[PDB]
């Protein structure tokens, strides 16, 4: 499979500072394309990607309404969630959701997603069958009973299998120059002495898209997982990502180490070493 569409929603209450803020960001893989924020001076669904801009007036209004209505729905949910946990109306809380679909190279549904987390803990999720639910605790079971009764899963399923897959297919075609382009990482190894006894070899990966990558170090062909310091892949701000893996090595032994890079924008995986 090769692509995915996903909406990340965050609703957070703030007692005494107005109604809960709701923001929804939409993505195609690692490319954000829309945002909706109830805190914007004039909340509307707005482009964050060039290829979504061509969509007509009707597209923006329909989606602006969906997110305006989702704001009220999430606000009502947070109210209910406080009750399910016997929580005070003085505390601030967070309801997060992720929904979307994954499609294969032929654009066929690989799988749907619709899950929620309350205050950072998983709360409830639509199972892969797109028919049943998994609740985390007795509070989530209340949400499950209500959803089962209103036949909510059937509604999510039609969205995940129909509407979601179709918009993803449309988006992918409209932004084919970027969405369907993998940019390989530019790689190199640096070397920083630490003392007379050891030096750091840092393997770099820059300018790559999508974010997914694997950087590893091997000493004598052996993986150095326990000894490698790996940073979290970070956005450069130009749509690309960066990442590095470092290992402290004894002086004079640098040539026994090899950095291995795997990225989908590379035909065959790379093997690099420090070049004095």
């Amino acid at each position: 499979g090769s692509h995915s569409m996903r909406y990340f929603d965050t609703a957070m209450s703030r007692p005494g500072r107005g109604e809960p803020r709701f923001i929804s960001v939409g993505y195609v893989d690692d490319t954000q394309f829309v945002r909706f924020d109830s805190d914007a001076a004039s909340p509307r669904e707005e482009p964050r990607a060039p290829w979504i801009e061509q969509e007509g007036p009707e597209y923006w209004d329909r989606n602006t309404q969906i997110f305006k209505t989702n704001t009220q729905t999430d606000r009502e949910s947070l109210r209910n969630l406080r009750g399910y946990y016997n929580q005070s109306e003085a505390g601030s809380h967070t309801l997060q959701s992720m929904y979307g679909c994954d499609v294969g190279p032929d654009g066929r549904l690989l799988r749907g997603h619709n899950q929620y987390a309350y205050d950072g803990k998983d709360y409830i999720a639509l199972n892969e069958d797109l028919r049943s639910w998994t609740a985390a605790d007795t509070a989530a079971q209340i949400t499950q009973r209500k959803w089962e009764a209103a036949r909510v899963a059937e509604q999510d399923r039609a969205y995940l299998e129909g509407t979601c897959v179709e918009w993803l297919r449309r988006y992918l075609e409209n932004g084919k120059d970027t969405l369907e382009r993998a940019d390989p990482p530019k790689t190199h190894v640096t070397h920083h002495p630490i003392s007379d006894h050891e030096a750091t070899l840092r393997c770099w990966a820059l300018g790559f898209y999508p974010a997914e990558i694997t950087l590893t170090w091997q000493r004598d062909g052996e993986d150095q997982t326990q000894d490698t310091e790996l940073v979290e892949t970070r956005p450069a701000g130009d749509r690309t990502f960066q990442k590095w893996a470092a290992v402290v090595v004894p002086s004079g032994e640098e040539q026994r180490y090899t950095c291995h890079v795997q990225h989908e924008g590379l035909p065959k995986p790379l093997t690099l070493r420090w070049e004095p």
């Binding site: 909406y7 969906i66 997110f67 209505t69 989702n70 729905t73 709360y123 969205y159 918009w167």
Partner: peptide, 8 residues
Amino acid sequence: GGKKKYRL
């Protein structure tokens, strides 16, 4: 396109 959400 967004999805219609249901109250928890």
